[PDB]
Structure 1
Amino acid sequence: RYKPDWESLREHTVPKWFDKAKFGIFIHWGIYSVPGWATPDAWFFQNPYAEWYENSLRIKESPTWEYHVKTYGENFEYEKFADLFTAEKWDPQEWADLFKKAGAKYVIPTTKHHDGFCLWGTKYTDFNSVKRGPKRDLVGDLAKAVREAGLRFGVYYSGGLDWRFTTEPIRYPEDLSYIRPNTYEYADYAYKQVMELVDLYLPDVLWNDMGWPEKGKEDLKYLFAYYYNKHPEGSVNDRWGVPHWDFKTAEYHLPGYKWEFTRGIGLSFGYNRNEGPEHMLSVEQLVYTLVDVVSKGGNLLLNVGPKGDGTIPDLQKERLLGLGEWLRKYGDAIYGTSVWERCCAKTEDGTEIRFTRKCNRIFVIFLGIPTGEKIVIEDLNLSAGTVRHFLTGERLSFKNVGKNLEITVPKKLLETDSITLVLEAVE
């Protein structure tokens, strides 16, 4: 039983389901999705994250302001996007089904992003999807659908930033230090809202962003204790600005700790019209990224930015479904695995290789499919055992040659693989 102090909360280790899940879907959706626009040390003047629309708009003359004055006019307050956000083509079951086939094991929507708009029927502000726009509990309906599809549900909350409590935009990164809600009122609000999400939706992940208000950091002792005692399988990210977390997050990419890399299929998290497939990962690069991350002990949290009407952009769909097809073939070498002696190796040709492990098995995942039958892996040796082609299970001849390892794979099997050659060695 967890007590509200850091020493006791350290007893809560990362839950097993999270280490085994490997792949989760982030969803950045809100009233910013309605305009759904961003540009192609002044990152905040030329912000490619469309979720940040309100911030960009508050910086007058920026590319986001100039786009806004054309489309909606100068007297359109950012706040009015909430009435246009009717999510009328939204089918939460379709989303859930899409995420399942993508091969995702958990799903995490933005319940409240930096703009302060809440995607549930919170008692603590009318600025929410039940009283405005969709007239719908979006978070609850999505949780229901996610779990009907057999998946786990978590919640994102923008604890550290809420532009309902500020009027001034972030122009440079140092503006983050002081352009914050700052009040005791806000500290209470954020604590009350995350408590509300815990009690209403029992999420398996609490995914905070942008730190936590200084005045509320001691409250997290109590929130984490409460959450873990009610829901021990629950897990917490590392963006709270306090000594406790269950896993770490990265956005720019062997650790003995659990972590999670998150990016969008493109550059933005929120839907961005102005993006296009030249800034987007191919199915191939998405598979390589997932494989690299997993070989290094991480989970991939891949983001989807839906349109204001509740449809997921065609490109995004295609990439998720292609990722899912790869995972349907090669999932055994990803789900439920642990890191091996090292993440990485390479062939003589220059093909990168990644290792995962399930018990005695070490999966050898090639980021690419070699052209010839003679594959030579550098700096690697294997004791006596059996090496097999993963997809067909076909036995393979292998030998140790100096410090390298020569494996011989029939062309017939190579032509069978998709994106990655995968082998499998039982020592």
Structure 2
Amino acid sequence: RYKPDWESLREHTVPKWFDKAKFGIFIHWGIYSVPGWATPTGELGKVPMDAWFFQNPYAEWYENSLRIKESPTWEYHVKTYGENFEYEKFADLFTAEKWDPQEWADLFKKAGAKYVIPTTKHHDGFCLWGTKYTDFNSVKRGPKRDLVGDLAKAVREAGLRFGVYYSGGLDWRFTTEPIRYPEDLSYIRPNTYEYADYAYKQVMELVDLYLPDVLWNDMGWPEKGKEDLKYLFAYYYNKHPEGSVNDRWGVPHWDFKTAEYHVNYPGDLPGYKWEFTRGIGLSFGYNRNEGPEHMLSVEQLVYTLVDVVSKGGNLLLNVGPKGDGTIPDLQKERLLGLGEWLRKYGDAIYGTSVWERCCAKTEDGTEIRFTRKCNRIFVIFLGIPTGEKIVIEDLNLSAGTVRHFLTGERLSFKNVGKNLEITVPKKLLETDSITLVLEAVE
């Protein structure tokens, strides 16, 4: 048994399956998905925090933006829904009438994802399962359906791992004042013993009802409730050893760390398991204002995943569905394109380990990322070189044998000074999709 204390919980380390999975889907879906609107201002880490809450690109922060009068959101809301339409009222319009979980799980599997994590309760405090601790949930209002439960069955049926996202740190059902500056987060929080019990009970309920593969908390854990985590994590791991927990609880233990857009993104191998998270666009919740100008292209998604993976992380890519339960085509296209590249190069991604270095670049600037599997070293070019002579800056190989990953075709190479030169016949180069992938073997 794991015991209820940090020294003992330290024994649990990130499970094998998570380390090997590399790619998962995040799903931010809630009553905010109905207005589904935000100012697509920019990437977290690049927008000045003096403006951020006032021009918030995270559409799921709609209620908070709505409480800031004379915020683009406030204006949009009054013209669209009216001054007398309270935010909570959206739970009645959140009907998920066109929702088909098996259809979601299938798309996620086709996309190459090995795990799925939906928002069981985001900052607005509305719960997507039949919790017994509040009536502001999807069984009693809106869909009249246990979304978490139904989605979990669907994802598992598809053979994918299922985790849960819970907003332990924020619950706007316990505050009245909006967050306007980062500073406000230090005091506009539920704060009561009551809320700390609520959060503990709700996560315990998620563990009991769905035994998730990942407990993904956000925004820290209520100070008054932090000690409870020793008990909750021991309870969880004892029921599910292969379960995992992220790093946003504000306590000693965690199985993997997280980075969001520019925030906490590692420049090199970090030395611990981590996971990068971002929306396909700038929001997590569905944003009707985003167009392709705001989203990653398939090529960019692939480069993202590869960079993240070569630095030891998993990519937890977010999808933001509509109030009706459908996934916007802009997002679907991208998921399928990524899936297509993973069907082809999966073997250089899935189940891989980091190598001695994550990165290299060609003489003319083509970035290169490395992954490994025992003695086999995968060389992933972010893009496909045009010529056949290829010069890799600052790399020597002691493999004696380098092959073209897609064909298996052995290739010609030599250590030329502090560099590595290789010849790739344009006919092979012509077969690669978004990345030229070579495979060395020492």
Classify the TM-score, shorter chain.
Answer: over 0.9
Cα distance in 2 between the residues matched to 1:328 and 1:217: 42
Is residue 370–residue 379 contact of structure 2 (8 Å, CA) maintained in 1? yes
Is residue 204–residue 232 contact of structure 2 (8 Å, CA) maintained in 1? yes
Cα distance in 1 between the residues matched to 2:91 and 2:391: 58
Please give the secondary structure, in 2, of the residue aligned with 1:387: strand
Cα distance in 1 between the residues matched to 2:277 and 2:400: 37
What displacement does 1:255 show?
1.4
What displacement does 1:279 show?
1.1
Please give the secondary structure, in 2, of the residue aligned with 1:363: strand
Give unpaired runs (5+ residues) of structure 2: 41-49, 263-268
Q: Structure 2 vs 1, CA of residues 217 and 127 (structure 1 numbering), >3 Å: closer, same or farther? A: same
Is residue 399–residue 440 contact of structure 2 (8 Å, CA) maintained in 1? no
Cα distance in 1 between the residues matched to 2:384 and 2:297: 16
Q: Deviations over 1:340-371 (max 9, x none)?
A: 00000011111000000000001000000000
TM-score (norm 1): 0.99
Is residue 255–residue 273 contact of structure 2 (8 Å, CA) maintained in 1? yes
Cα distance in 2 between the residues matched to 1:425 and 1:107: 33
Cα distance in 2 between the residues matched to 1:280 and 1:86: 27
Q: Deviations over 1:287-335 (max 9, x none)?
A: 0000000000100000000000000010000000000000000000000
Cα distance in 2 between the residues matched to 1:384 and 1:361: 9
Cα distance in 2 between the residues matched to 1:230 and 1:117: 27
Please give the secondary structure, in 2, of the residue aligned with 1:418: coil
Name the stretch that deviates more: 252-261 or 139-148. Answer: 252-261
What displacement does 1:385 show?
2.4
Q: Deviations over 1:78-124 (max 9, x none)?
A: 00000000000000011000000000000000000000000000000
Cα distance in 2 between the residues matched to 1:152 and 1:196: 19
Kindly, what percent of the aligned residue pairs are identical? 100
Cα distance in 1 between the residues matched to 2:201 and 2:100: 29
Runs of 4+ with deviation above 3 angstroms: none
Please give the secondary structure, in 1, of the residue aligned with 2:379: strand
Q: Corresponding residue for 1:364?
A: 379
What displacement does 1:178 show?
0.8
Name the stretch that deviates more: 297-306 or 377-386. Answer: 377-386
Cα distance in 2 between the residues matched to 1:70 and 1:300: 38
Is residue 396–residue 415 contact of structure 2 (8 Å, CA) maintained in 1? yes
Verify: 1:299 aligned to 2:308, yes or no: no
Q: Corresponding residue for 2:19?
A: 19
Cα distance in 1 between the residues matched to 2:361 and 2:84: 58
Please give the secondary structure, in 1, of the residue aligned with 2:411: strand
What displacement does 1:2 show?
0.7
Cα distance in 1 between the residues matched to 2:69 and 2:31: 20
What displacement does 1:384 show?
4.0
State which of 381, 399, 402 in structure 2 corresponds to 1:387.
402
Alignment of 1:19-418 (within 5 A): 19-40=19-40, 41-253=50-262, 254-418=269-433
Give unpaired runs (5+ residues) of structure 1: none
Q: Structure 2 vs 1, CA of residues 100 and 384 (structure 1 numbering), >3 Å: closer, same or farther? A: closer
TM-score (norm 2): 0.96
Q: Deviations over 1:359-392 (max 9, x none)?
A: 0001000000000111111111111421110011
Q: Structure 2 vs 1, CA of residues 379 and 310 (structure 1 numbering), >3 Å: closer, same or farther? A: same
Is residue 276–residue 313 contact of structure 2 (8 Å, CA) maintained in 1? yes
Cα distance in 2 between the residues matched to 1:180 and 1:117: 16
What displacement does 1:38 show?
0.3
Please give the secondary structure, in 1, of the residue aligned with 2:165: strand
Q: Deviations over 1:234-282 (max 9, x none)?
A: 0000000101100000013421100000000000000001111101100
Q: Structure 2 vs 1, CA of residues 117 and 384 (structure 1 numbering), >3 Å: closer, same or farther? A: closer
Cα distance in 2 between the residues matched to 1:214 and 1:242: 10
Is residue 102–residue 155 contact of structure 2 (8 Å, CA) maintained in 1? yes
What displacement does 1:230 show?
0.6
Please give the secondary structure, in 2, of the residue aligned with 1:278: helix
Cα distance in 2 between the residues matched to 1:348 and 1:256: 28
Q: Deviations over 1:47-93 (max 9, x none)?
A: 00000000000001110000000111110000000000000000001
Cα distance in 2 between the residues matched to 1:358 and 1:383: 16
Cα distance in 1 between the residues matched to 2:337 and 2:325: 21
Aligned length: 427
Cα distance in 1 between the residues matched to 2:185 and 2:51: 14
What displacement does 1:42 show?
1.8
Q: Deviations over 1:138-191 (max 9, x none)?
A: 000000000111100000000000000111111111111111111100000000
Cα distance in 1 between the residues matched to 2:55 and 2:398: 54
Is residue 260–residue 276 contact of structure 2 (8 Å, CA) maintained in 1? yes
Please give the secondary structure, in 1, of the residue aligned with 2:292: coil
Cα distance in 1 between the residues matched to 2:4 and 2:100: 40
Cα distance in 2 between the residues matched to 1:179 and 1:3: 33
Cα distance in 2 between the residues matched to 1:171 and 1:403: 52
Please give the secondary structure, in 1, of the residue aligned with 2:69: coil
Cα distance in 2 between the residues matched to 1:216 and 1:179: 16
What displacement does 1:23 show?
0.2
Q: Structure 2 vs 1, CA of residues 343 and 384 (structure 1 numbering), >3 Å: closer, same or farther? A: closer
Please give the secondary structure, in 1, of the residue aligned with 2:212: coil
Cα distance in 1 between the residues matched to 2:320 and 2:258: 19
Please give the secondary structure, in 2, of the residue aligned with 1:379: coil
Cα distance in 1 between the residues matched to 2:319 and 2:373: 30
